[model samples]
Target: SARISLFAVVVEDMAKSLEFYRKLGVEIPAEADSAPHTEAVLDGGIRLAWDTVETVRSYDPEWQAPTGGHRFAIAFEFPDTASVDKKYAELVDAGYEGHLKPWNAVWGQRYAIVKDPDGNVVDLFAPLPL
Candidate 1:
């Protein structure tokens, strides 16, 4: 069977994006740190990767960054609702864009959305017991 492996995307700038994830506690290796292309194997056994617009255009020759909102999101779960609330506040206060403020959802989860430097949504969620 084919196992799931990586979550990757194109970024506006490698340095800025790396800083954001680093604050979120993800590691980007030194070799992958400087880039036209990069991949960091996150602590969870999967690699999170990125490609610069130039890196894409180098191959396709006509690739362009998309405009408007994101399609899907990369979500993360915390130990509890309070942890979700705390981290959400920290990220937004550090100047990252918080797409949606933290709140208790009708679905029984505490949730929020924070945008990465590339404007990708990183969803923060935790189960809320009824």
Candidate 2:
């Protein structure tokens, strides 16, 4: 029996992906700044990794990022509703794509979505003010 080892993304460009994650406060090791592959180890020994499409093709030679609508969205939690809206505005003003505008969700959280360089939807959310 094998357990889930790592969760990785096949990126079109390492630099762009690194920048996007960096702005969102994700810690990236300097060694991975320009490398083709990198990983951020989280607690519980799980790892969030990344690799370029070129890196993938070097071995498999045929892997591709799926086309059209998103197959998934990664969620990040903010400390408060204000943080969610503030970060959303900052990222959009910085020239990155903003998806869903920040709003108080019916489910009781302030939520928003933004697109990464690769068009992946990154969901930013937080608890709404009472």
Candidate 3:
């Protein structure tokens, strides 16, 4: 049986992508900004990694970088709903693309969506007290 252990995003600009995730509180080393590939260990030993599109194409020449209509998002959970709103504003203020504004979801959480430098969907959310 196999279990999921790592999630990686193919990025066009390593520096820009790393900076975006860093603002979201991911602990990527500053040195990684120049590396071809970088990884950040998340909770429960899960690893989030990034590799430049050129780095990936070096091995798989046919791999295509995604364009438009992001198929999925990496969701982040904040401690409270207020943090969700604050973070959403902060990222948009910094020039990240805001796909969705923070709102109270019918399912009882504060949620918003933003796109990373490489156009990957990033979700910010927090549960509301029932």
Candidate 4:
């Protein structure tokens, strides 16, 4: 069986980027005494890493970071409809720009979308009861 072991995200600034995710209830790991990366784990065992652009550039010299407008969106599933509203309110209060206000989706889920400082979208959702 093939299992996915890790997931990582490249961030322009570790401290600032980590702070935004931390506000969303992510558990950040202490930075390694000798390393240049920071990491956190959120609900559902998703692991996220924050690394400097130069740190990533070292691996691929030609890599270019995209600026502005929807590079990717990370979607999370909550347990109930109320959780969807609660989480959306939390993000809005924390200064995240709300892209889509909480609403019922045709796919049987309630959803909301927010944009991070770097323009990446994060979606929160809760499925309607069966």
Best by TM-score: 3
Q: Point out where model 2 deviates above 4 Å.
A: none
Q: Sort every candidate by TM-score, greatest first.
A: 3, 2, 1, 4
Q: With candidate 1 superimposed using the best TM-score fit, by how many Å does residue 124's alpha carbon deviate from the native? A: 0.4
Q: Relative to the unseen true structure, what is the C-alpha lDDT of residue 82 in candidate 3, on a scale of 0 to 100?
A: 93
Candidate 2 TM-score, C-alpha based: 0.90
- Which of 2 and 3 is the better model by lDDT? 3
Candidates in order have lDDT scores of 0.83, 0.87, 0.93, 0.77
- Candidate 4 per-residue lDDT, tens place, 1-130, comes to 9766456777666766777776666776545322458765655766676677778889887877786778678788888999999989988898879999999998989989998766788989988888
**Regions more than 4 Å wrong, model 1:** 1-3, 42-45
Better model by lDDT: candidate 1 vs candidate 2: 2
How would you encode candidate 2's per-residue C-alpha lDDT over 1-130 as one tens digit per residue? 9987787888999988988888887789766868999988777888778899899999979887776767768789999999999999999998888988999899999999998888788999998878
Ranking by lDDT: 3, 2, 1, 4
lDDT by residue for model 3 over 37-88, one digit each (tens)? 9999988999999999889999998988777888768999999999999999
Candidate 4 runs further than 4 Å off: 1-3, 30-35, 41-46, 68-71
TM-score of predicted structure 4: 0.76
Once model 3 is optimally superposed onto the true structure by TM-score, how far is the C-alpha of residue 25 displaced, in angstroms?
1.0
lDDT at residue 106 of model 2 (Cα atoms): 98
Clashing pairs in 4: none
In model 2, which residue pairs have backbone atoms overlapping below 3 Å? none
